[PDB]
Amino acid sequence: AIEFDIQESKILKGVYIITPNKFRDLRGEIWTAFTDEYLSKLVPDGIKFKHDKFINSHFNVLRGIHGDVKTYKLVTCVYGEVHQVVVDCRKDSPTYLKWEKFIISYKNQQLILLPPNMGNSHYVSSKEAVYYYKLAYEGEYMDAPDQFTYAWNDERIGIDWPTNTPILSDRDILATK
Amino acid sequence: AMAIEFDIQESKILKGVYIITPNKFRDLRGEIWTAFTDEYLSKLVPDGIKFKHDKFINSHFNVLRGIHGDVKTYKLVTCVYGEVHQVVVDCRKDSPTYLKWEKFIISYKNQQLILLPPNMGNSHYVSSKEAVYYYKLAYEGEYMDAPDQFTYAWNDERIGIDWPTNTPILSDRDILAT
Ligand SMILES: Nc1nc2c(ncn2[C@@H]2O[C@H](COP(=O)(O)OP(=O)(O)O)[C@@H](O)[C@H]2O)c(=O)[nH]1
Numbered sequence: 001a002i003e004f005d006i007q008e009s010k011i012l013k014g015v016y017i018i019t020p021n022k023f024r025d026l027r028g029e030i031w032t033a034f035t036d037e038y039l040s041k042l043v044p045d046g047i048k049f050k051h052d053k054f055i056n057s058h059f060n061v062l063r064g065i066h067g068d069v070k071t072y073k074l075v076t077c078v079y080g081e082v083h084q085v086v087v088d089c090r091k092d093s094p095t096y097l098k099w100e101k102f103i104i105s106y107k108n109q110q111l112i113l114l115p116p117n118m119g120n121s122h123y124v125s126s127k128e129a130v131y132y133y134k135l136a137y138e139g140e141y142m143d144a145p146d147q148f149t150y151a152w153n154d155e156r157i158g159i160d161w162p163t164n165t166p167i168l169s170d171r172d173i174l175a176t177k
Numbered sequence: 178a179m180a181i182e183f184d185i186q187e188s189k190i191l192k193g194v195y196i197i198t199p200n201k202f203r204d205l206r207g208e209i210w211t212a213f214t215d216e217y218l219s220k221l222v223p224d225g226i227k228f229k230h231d232k233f234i235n236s237h238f239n240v241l242r243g244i245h246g247d248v249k250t251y252k253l254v255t256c257v258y259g260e261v262h263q264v265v266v267d268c269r270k271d272s273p274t275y276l277k278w279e280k281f282i283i284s285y286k287n288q289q290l291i292l293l294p295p296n297m298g299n300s301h302y303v304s305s306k307e308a309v310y311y312y313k314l315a316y317e318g319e320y321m322d323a324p325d326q327f328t329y330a331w332n333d334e335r336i337g338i339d340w341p342t343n344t345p346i347l348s349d350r351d352i353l354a355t
């Protein structure tokens with residue numbers, strides 16, 4: 001019954017697009033976002049998905065670009081719509097500072113796996129959105145002080161966003177200067 | 178850095194059922210919160226049993242789902258968008274509260290995750306326009322799909338659940354139980 005299509009990105013090595021199946025009828029939809037059996041093999045042995053988070057954001061909010069040295073992230077949108085943008089922040093990568101966009105609609109389920117040293121960002125194109133992500137890492141959670149931040153509009157990255165005037169946290173503003 | 182926190186209270190009326198309340202960082206952009214960590218919450222289920230399965234149910238207004246359960250699955254349930262009337266039923270025949278129930282009205286204003294042990298009846302009713310229902314499942318071995326689950330009628334008079342309507346939208350499984 002439960003299934004996952006798993007494709008590697010054609011642009012960024014190590015980034016995977018996971019597409020679950022669902023039971024859909026007129027009443028709504030039911031689906032499995034993760035099982036340990038099918039998806040734990042996306043991260044190397046000894047590192048476990050052990051942390052689930054949600055971000056409720058309003059229209060025109062942009063969060064990013066955030067990353068750290070050890071955390072794998074499995075991300076999606078379970079209500080509304082986001083422009084999810086993954087940035088290659090691995091300095092030893094031949095695609096360093098290239099990016100890939102997924103427009104993730106809660107009607108079309110797509111989970112994106114980001115390895116460590118990748119930049120995570122998203123922009124809310126719907127009225128509200130709910131962003132779900134699982135984190136896999138060893139040891140303590142890497143909070144804001146232990147993360148790096150690239151500016152949402154860094155010209156070296158050149159991300160194509162739907163606006164020039166998003167709503168940004170003070171952290172995400174600070175990175176523009 | 179606002180630290181990740183969980184308040185954990187046992188239900189005053191159904192032994193073995195826990196109400197988990199996370200903290201949140203709220204600002205003008207919206208909200209960020211942690212629904213689960215292994216470090217804080219794995220101790221809600223006995224040793225050897227792991228939360229290993231995450232599911233979502235997107236439903237419309239007036240949809241009722243339930244009452245579903247099985248012999249071995251622990252469930253950690255909440256609503257991450259909209260509002261549900263979450264109702265837990267004690268389906269443990271040894272229990273002195275067998276077929277009693279407890280309601281939690283769950284939304285982002287009262288962000289609340291409910292832990293159900295095995296042999297408990299899980300149900301919810303969607304009181305908002307749309308809702309997203311998130312739940313984690315902990316169990317050993319294979320997933321228990323619909324044929325290996327029990328079903329009590331949403332309106333079973335022996336249970337006597339107070340729902341906001343007499344005319345919910347029901348799956349054919351949940352109708353069959355009438
Ligand atoms: N792909 C997928 N299908 C699911 C999931 N959960 C439930 N279903 C399907 O939803 C269908 C309807 O569920 P339900 O009405 O409770 O039981 P049934 O009518 O007796 O099968 C079943 O065929 C399940 O296999 C899931 O996580 N993923």
Ligand SMILES: Nc1nc2c(ncn2[C@@H]2O[C@H](COP(=O)(O)OP(=O)(O)O)[C@@H](O)[C@H]2O)c(=O)[nH]1
Pocket residue numbers: 053143144169170171172178179180181182200201202209210211
């Ligand atoms: N309570 C809680 N706070 C969190 C969580 N995740 C992040 N935060 C906090 O949210 C705040 C805002 O993050 P952000 O604006 O991106 O970074 P900041 O501006 O440097 O604080 C920080 O203080 C984090 O510690 C969580 O799961 N729960």
